[PDB]
Swiss-Prot record:
Protein name, UniProt field: Fe(3+) dicitrate transport protein FecA
Subunit structure: Interacts (via periplasmic N-terminus) with FecR (via periplasmic C-terminus).
Name of the gene: fecA
Induction or repression: For induction, the TonB and the ExbB proteins have to be active. Regulation by the iron level mediated by the Fur protein and induction by citrate plus iron suggest that the Fe(3+) dicitrate complex must enter the periplasm where it binds to a transmembrane protein, which regulates transcription of the fec genes directly or via a further inductor. Induced 2-fold by hydroxyurea.
Domain of life of the native organism: Bacteria
Cited function: FecA is the outer membrane receptor protein in the Fe(3+) dicitrate transport system.
Compartments (UniProt record): Cell outer membrane
Motif (TonB box): 23-30
Similarity comment: family membership: Belongs to the TonB-dependent receptor family.
Species, as recorded: Escherichia coli (strain K12)
Length: 104
């Protein structure tokens, strides 16, 4: 199922995919409020697409009752540091300025 969601908000990206799937999800938004998540792009089911959204930290998803799933902290290897981002093209222009000294 082709699902394209724009990032810039974890809470949003959640409702976006959650609405496309049709299931319930219970996750501690306490920590969520303040961070963002990677949107989706391509044919991905409820689970496939869901894992693609939070994809980046690696967590576990398990159901609770009917069709309600939750996200919990799972074990991971010794985290590392990714390369440092470079810069953009920056094709702007600059204007000259005038300044003269004065006496008493």
């Amino acid at each position: 199922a082709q699902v394209n969601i724009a990032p810039g908000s974890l809470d949003k990206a959640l409702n976006q995919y959650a609405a496309h799937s049709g299931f319930t999800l219970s996750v501690d938004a306490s920590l969520t409020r303040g961070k963002q998540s990677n949107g989706l792009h391509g044919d991905y089911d409820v689970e496939s697409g869901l894992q693609q959204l939070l994809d980046g930290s690696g967590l576990q998803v398990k159901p609770l009752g009917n069709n309600s799933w939750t996200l919990e902290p799972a074990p991971a290897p010794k985290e590392d540091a990714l390369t440092v981002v470079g810069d953009w093209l920056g094709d702007a222009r600059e204007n000259d300025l005038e300044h003269h000294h004065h006496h008493h």
